[PDB]
């Protein structure tokens, strides 16, 4: 089957910059069968480009498609705030039809340091017989920083993420953060 591999996994650029997304196929395919899709958080996908270069209905000129054989490229000439999302390449040339991994285009910005706030467990939960300790990082950039984690989407207003790691200890209990913005590791 044709495996489509997308690069890079994440692209970080400021508005008004050019973005270049790549899609490589394991086997060769006709440009006629290649489509690009855009998907925003909590939204259904939207067809951008079909037949490698053709724009879908209502798609602006900044979006371009090109390529042949095993290499295809999606290009946004001047990035806009609406443009930052995830893009998937798709091929119908071979059966079964496949989708690419996806490429996330995020907003590049001046490095911002996180704010660390640690919350010890509540009494009611303690009484219940389980203990959770929550470390929270507020409004930092970039994202690169038993415990389970959760991260938010890039903030529309200030272009930052926020992450909350939760450590679930036993019934009787009886948080270092590392980031580029921080000159030295911050323990709380």
């Amino acid at each position: 089957e044709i495996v489509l591999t997308q690069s890079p996994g994440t692209l970080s650029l400021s508005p008004g910059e050019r973005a270049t997304l790549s899609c490589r196929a394991s086997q060769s395919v006709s440009s006629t069968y290649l489509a690009w899709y855009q998907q925003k958080p909590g939204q259904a996908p939207r067809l951008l480009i079909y037949g490698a270069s053709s724009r879908a209905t209502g798609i602006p000129d900044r979006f371009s498609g090109s390529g042949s054989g095993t290499d295809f490229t999606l290009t946004i000439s001047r990035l806009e705030p609406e443009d930052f999302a995830v893009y998937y390449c798709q091929q119908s040339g071979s059966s079964p039809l496949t989708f690419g991994g996806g490429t996330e285009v995020e907003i590049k910005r001046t490095v911002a340091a996180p704010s660390v706030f640690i919350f010890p467990p509540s009494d009611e939960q303690l009484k219940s017989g389980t203990a959770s300790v929550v470390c929270l990082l507020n409004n930092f950039y970039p994202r690169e920083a038993n415990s389970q984690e959760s991260v938010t989407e890039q903030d529309s207003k200030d272009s930052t993420y926020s992450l909350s790691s939760t450590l679930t200890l036993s019934k009787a209990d009886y948080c270092e953060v590392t980031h580029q913005g921080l000159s030295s590791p911050v323990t709380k």
């Binding site: 006709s30 042949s68 054989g69 095993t70 290499d71």
Partner: peptide
């Protein structure tokens, strides 16, 4: 090799 391949729509 890159240019020869993918040159047929069916």
């Amino acid at each position: 090799k890159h240019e020869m391949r993918g040159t047929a729509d069916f």
